[PDB]
Write a protein that binds this ligand. Structure first.
Ligand code: CLA
Ligand code: CLA
Ligand code: CLA
Ligand code: CLA
Ligand code: CLA
Ligand code: CLA
Ligand SMILES: CCCCCCCCCCCCCCCCCC(=O)OC[C@H](CO[C@@H]1O[C@H](CO)[C@H](O)[C@H](O)[C@H]1O)OC(=O)CCCCCCCCCCCCCCCCC
Ligand SMILES: CCCCCCCCCCCCCCCCCC(=O)OC[C@H](CO[C@@H]1O[C@H](CO)[C@H](O)[C@H](O)[C@H]1O)OC(=O)CCCCCCCCCCCCCCCCC
Ligand SMILES: CC(=O)O[C@H]1CC(C)(C)C(=C=C/C(C)=C/C=C/C(C)=C\C=C\C=C(C)/C=C\C=C(\C)C(=O)C[C@@]23O[C@]2(C)C[C@@H](O)CC3(C)C)[C@](C)(O)C1
Ligand code: KC1
Ligand code: KC1
Lengths: 172, 164, 179, 89
């Protein structure tokens, strides 16, 4: 009845499944927006930032692709966006993200009209890793994804701001 | 009926002091839960403010931007830290707290599921509600006195210029 | 009552408060009595402030000359809003925004007083704030509503008197004995 | 379905999101959209007249165009704030 993260606010009451729940949501976006959309957005914000904070850390700590293509030679992670769109690069990344996001949009749109799809469910599990696991263990691994995703969202925002404001690379 | 719904009808001698001459709690009877959540908020702010004016006049935090050479007494701490950053840092986090915590707190108070003034600090809070009610009027009386104390300190330190 | 100057009965020679239910042709095109009473109180309350604003800023004889140091200096009241909205734009907007929020809030909680569907009595903007319906008796606050109504009607005639002098410069001969 | 009687529509005419929002939250959002739109119009006015910031349409900023469309959003959220208040939120 009371929120766990904020034990003076009531429980938001729309978070009752949803493995990463702290009862946290004070502004009650779960009251106004569908929780299937909100968890799909949290998961997608999470696994993008998990790749992004590892890709910003790797590029700032040396580690270019070898051999380096033309136009990406003296370039850090804070200047690799515009240098890659001039080289080509992100133009092909944008093309294949677009055909993934247009196809996943039909997944999100059919999830909000039924279809029983879990938010943040694609078929992508090629290395097994869920070969008949129990639902208490499936929901535990889903909690590890949301917790690590929630950390990398705050981490990338720290890394990207500090690398541009104080003008340094990631071991500041 | 604010004196039966809420606690704090006392004076400095502990006698019963029903103090609403303008009758704002009867003219604005739906607002009296907001009136107590904001009286405590004004009270708890002024109690930290009166300490933070006196403690600044002897101790600074050890940085050079906060040093005694930069800000002379305590009254220049507001204006000589606006563009510096520390006033913008507390404006962010108090304003983030008031947007994310306090604004959902005052709508849960209007719906009736939390008490006004309660932000979850129940560690040293006694049970046996009249004992808690005695702690709230001690918070209220020290709060209401500090609201004049920070009015007195910040006004007298400008027209007279003296510290403490 | 408030009909002592006009006999002892309500005064309406053009019968403008009967136009809505006189015929059936213009359905809810004329306001009903709740809107007419609320607009009478509001026009009177604005005229009671506006006549005081011309009287307190007039610098000649018999009109007391008040001024706020920092305000623009134009004693001509027919041009003082233009010099205030240009030189003090943030103060002019904060006054207008306060007027805006108070005006929308005054009907935003109640209903359609144009169709007599409002839930509050006309004139009550929730701004008692100091007593006095709780303090004074039931016939004293009914006496004070008639006072605010008649002082509002008197200042409305006064603001029509000031509007007429600036348009037709021989409208009010009584306003020549004060100079 | 969406027909209604009386002095105010039900909450469901606001869509599936704003029908659940409080009237005070929709009211404060409306002032926030109105202030962003009024700031965007006023700042695009001073960018038009600045002699180094208007050439070839350089007075057009993307955040001031997007900010100026808070105007119709301020209209709708204040209408929606009234409907939630009449419906008891
Ligand atoms: C930015 C993307 C994002 C999204 C879409 C969500 C969405 C959600 N979170 Mg998560 N959260 C996030 C980032 C996000 N979060 C981050 C970075 C952290 C670490 C601080 C958390 C920490 C957190 C906890 C500890 C819990 C949640 C919970 C929730 C759910 C509650 C709904 C709600 O009230 O807020 C959704 C709305 C927004 C985030 C909008 C924010 C934008 C404004 C304008 C700022 C919802 C699925 C609860 C849950 O999962 O249910 C059990 C829960 O217990 N969140
Ligand atoms: C009304 C609250 C208030 C405000 C607005 C200020 C403001 C200021 N203080 Mg002061 N201070 C306060 C209370 C306050 N203080 C109190 C109660 C004490 C005694 C502990 C002090 C002791 C103090 C010292 C020793 C120094 C300052 C200094 C300053 C100045 C800049 C750096 C700073 O923020 O100090 C840091 C703040 C503190 C050291 C006080 C900690 C805050 C206390 C514990 C209350 C917070 C509890 C509350 C739950 C926090 C919630 C935060 C919320 C966002 C979640 C700034 C003008 C510095 C200065 O040089 O002045 C020119 C300095 O050296 N203050
Ligand atoms: C602090 C920053 C700031 C700045 C720089 C401005 C600047 C401005 N504001 Mg803004 N405003 C601010 C803060 C600020 N405001 C704040 C904090 C609020 C509250 C949120 C507002 C809310 C606000 C509103 C509601 C309005 C403004 C308006 C204006 C513009 C005034 C122009 C004017 O008065 O011409 C007026 C014209 C004249 C003075 C010329 C006429 C003079 C002749 C001689 C008069 C002749 C008599 C005449 C015919 C009789 C008419 C009577 C009739 C009006 C009843 C100006 C650009 C106004 C605007 O232009 O919006 C589009 C406006 O309506 N502001
Ligand atoms: C024209 C469309 C329109 C409509 C349908 C509404 C409807 C409403 N307004 Mg809004 N309002 C409007 C425009 C409109 N308003 C404008 C232009 C302003 C000044 C910026 C406001 C300022 C305002 C405030 C401060 C408040 C409201 C409130 C309300 C609600 C209660 C009734 C009331 O008190 O408003 C009275 C509104 C007026 C007297 C002004 C509208 C008169 C228009 C200009 C008539 C001409 C319409 C025309 C045919 C087309 C419009 C063209 C456009 C460019 C103006 C109601 C939902 C209240 C509310 O509940 O908010 C949550 C409230 O407190 N309104
Ligand atoms: C942001 C907080 C806030 C809240 C919760 C309210 C709430 C209210 N105000 Mg508003 N008011 C506010 C800020 C607020 N006001 C501001 C910032 C202003 C500008 C100063 C006003 C100016 C104002 C006026 C002029 C009026 C209100 C009225 C009201 C009432 C509409 C419902 C009602 O009781 O009618 C009465 C219900 C029945 C008769 C049944 C309601 C209690 C109305 C009121 O109280 O009328 C009696 C009214 O006329 N308010
Ligand atoms: C006199 C002015 C006026 C008023 C008071 C209303 C009132 C209403 N409109 Mg209508 N509408 C109007 C003119 C008006 N309309 C005009 C001129 C158009 C364009 C032709 C529309 C197009 C329109 C649509 C498409 C819808 C409404 C809807 C509604 C209802 C919900 C409130 C709302 O808009 O959501 C408040 C929130 C917003 C408006 C956010 C959207 C921001 C946009 C860009 C503005 C409410 C009864 C809704 C409805 O009736 O659902 C069944 C709805 O779906 N209106
Ligand atoms: C721009 C202007 C913004 C208006 C202020 C909105 C900020 C929210 C706020 O004031 O708190 C909104 C609070 C919420 O208090 C109200 O009352 C109850 C609380 O006991 C319930 O919670 C109601 O639901 C809640 O709406 O209301 C007030 O502060 C009332 C102040 C009215 C005074 C204005 C008249 C000024 C003369
Ligand atoms: C901002 C997000 C919180 C807004 C909101 O929920 O209002 C929370 C509170 C009032 O809370 C109001 O409560 C009412 C019932 O009590 C209704 O439920 C309204 O929806 C709710 O807005 O508003 C504030 O005081 C926020 C002011 C922040 C802006 C200051 C300027
Ligand atoms: C309790 C709590 O919590 O808070 C309380 C606080 C408070 C304040 C007391 C309350 C209140 C009353 C409120 C909120 C009143 C608000 C009214 C509000 C906010 C708004 C009307 C806009 C009207 C129009 C016609 C706008 C634009 C109309 C148009 C046509 C445009 O903009 C055109 C344009 O867009 C384009 C098309 C193209 C652009 O290139 C150019 C422009 C920009 C020109 C509440 C409700 O009680 C909540
Ligand atoms: C299956 C169809 C397909 C073809 C046929 C194709 C071809 C080329 N790719 Mg592309 N590509 C994808 C698909 C395909 N690529 C996918 C799924 C991704 C992940 C989203 C992707 C990403 C990148 C990035 C970052 C770069 C890139 C490049 C080249 C360039 C190499 C020329 C060479 O090898 O000598 C040739 C034209 C580089 C470049 O030089 O762009 C100007 C470069 O930097 N690609
Ligand atoms: C948790 C996230 C977080 C980060 C990442 C962060 C960062 C910085 N803070 Mg902030 N801060 C809080 C949180 C965070 N701060 C909180 C919860 C409060 C209490 C409301 C708070 C208050 C103050 C005050 C009074 C000052 C302050 C400053 C700095 C500045 C250099 C710090 C250093 O290196 O010692 C860096 C950017 C000082 C400053 O130099 O401003 C120019 C300064 O005076 N902070």
């Amino acid at each position: 009845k009371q929120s766990q993260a904020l034990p003076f606010l009531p429980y938001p009451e729309n978070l009752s499944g949803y493995v990463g729940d702290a009862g946290f949501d004070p502004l009650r976006f779960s009251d106004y927006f569908p929780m299937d959309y909100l968890r799909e957005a949290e998961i997608k914000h999470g696994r993008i930032c998990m790749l992004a904070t590892v890709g910003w850390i790797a590029v700032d700590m040396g580690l270019r692709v070898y051999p380096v293509p033309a136009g990406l030679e003296g370039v850090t992670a804070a200047t690799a966006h515009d240098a890659s769109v001039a080289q080509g690069g992100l133009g092909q990344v944008f093309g294949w993200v677009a055909v993934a996001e247009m196809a996943s949009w039909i997944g999100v749109s059919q999830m909000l009209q039924g279809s029983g799809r879990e938010p943040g469910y694609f078929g992508f599990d090629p290395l097994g890793l869920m070969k008949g696991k129990s639902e208490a263990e499936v929901n535990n691994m889903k909690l590890k994804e949301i917790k690590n995703g929630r950390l990398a969202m705050l981490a990338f925002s720290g890394i990207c701001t500090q690398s541009v404001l104080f003008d340094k690379t990631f071991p500041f | 009926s604010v004196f039966d719904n809420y606690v704090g009808a006392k004076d400095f001698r502990g006698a019963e002091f029903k103090f609403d001459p303008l009758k704002l709690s009867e003219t604005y009877e739906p607002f009296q839960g907001w009136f107590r959540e904001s009286e405590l908020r004004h009270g708890r702010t002024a109690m930290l403010a009166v300490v933070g004016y006196i403690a600044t006049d002897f101790v600074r935090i050890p940085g050079e931007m906060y040093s005694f050479e930069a800000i002379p007494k305590s009254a220049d701490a507001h204006d000589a830290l606006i563009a510096s950053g520390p006033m913008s840092q507390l404006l962010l986090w108090i304003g983030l707290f008031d947007l994310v915590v306090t604004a959902p707190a005052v709508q849960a108070m209007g719906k009736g599921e939390r008490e006004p003034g309660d932000f979850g600090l129940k560690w040293f809070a006694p049970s046996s509600k009249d004992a808690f009610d005695k702690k709230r009027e001690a918070e209220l009386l020290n709060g209401r006195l500090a609201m004049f104390a920070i009015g007195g300190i910040a006004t007298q330190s400008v027209l007279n210029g003296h510290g403490f | 009552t408030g009909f002592e100057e006009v006999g002892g009965k309500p005064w309406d020679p053009l019968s403008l408060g009967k136009l809505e239910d006189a015929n059936d042709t213009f359905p809810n095109m004329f306001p009903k009595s709740q809107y007419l009473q609320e607009s009478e109180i509001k026009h009177g309350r604005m005229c009671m402030l506006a006549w005081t604003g011309v009287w307190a800023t007039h610098v000649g004889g018999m009109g007391l000359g008040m001024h706020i140091p920092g305000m623009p200096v134009e004693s001509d009241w027919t041009k003082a809003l233009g010099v205030f909205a240009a030189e003090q734009p943030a103060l002019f907007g904060a006054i207008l925004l306060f007027i805006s929020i108070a005006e929308g809030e005054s009907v935003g909680h109640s209903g359609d007083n144009w169709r007599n569907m409002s839930t509050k009595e006309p004139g009550n903007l929730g701004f008692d704030w100091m007593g006095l319906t709780k303090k004074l008796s039931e016939e004293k606050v009914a006496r004070y509503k008639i006072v605010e109504l008649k002082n509002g009607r008197a200042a409305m005639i006064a603001m029509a008197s000031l509007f007429a002098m600036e348009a037709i410069p021989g409208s009010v001969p009584i306003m020549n004995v004060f100079n | 379905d969406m027909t209604w009687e009386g002095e105010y529509p039900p909450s469901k005419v606001l869509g599936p999101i704003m029908s659940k929002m409080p009237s005070g939250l929709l009211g404060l959002i409306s002032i926030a959209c109105a202030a962003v739109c009024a700031y965007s119009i006023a700042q695009s006015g001073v960018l038009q007249q600045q002699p180094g910031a208007y050439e070839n349409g350089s007075w057009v900023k993307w955040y001031y165009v997007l900010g100026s469309f808070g105007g119709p959003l301020a209209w709708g959220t204040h209408v929606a704030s009234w409907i939630q208040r009449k419906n008891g939120m």
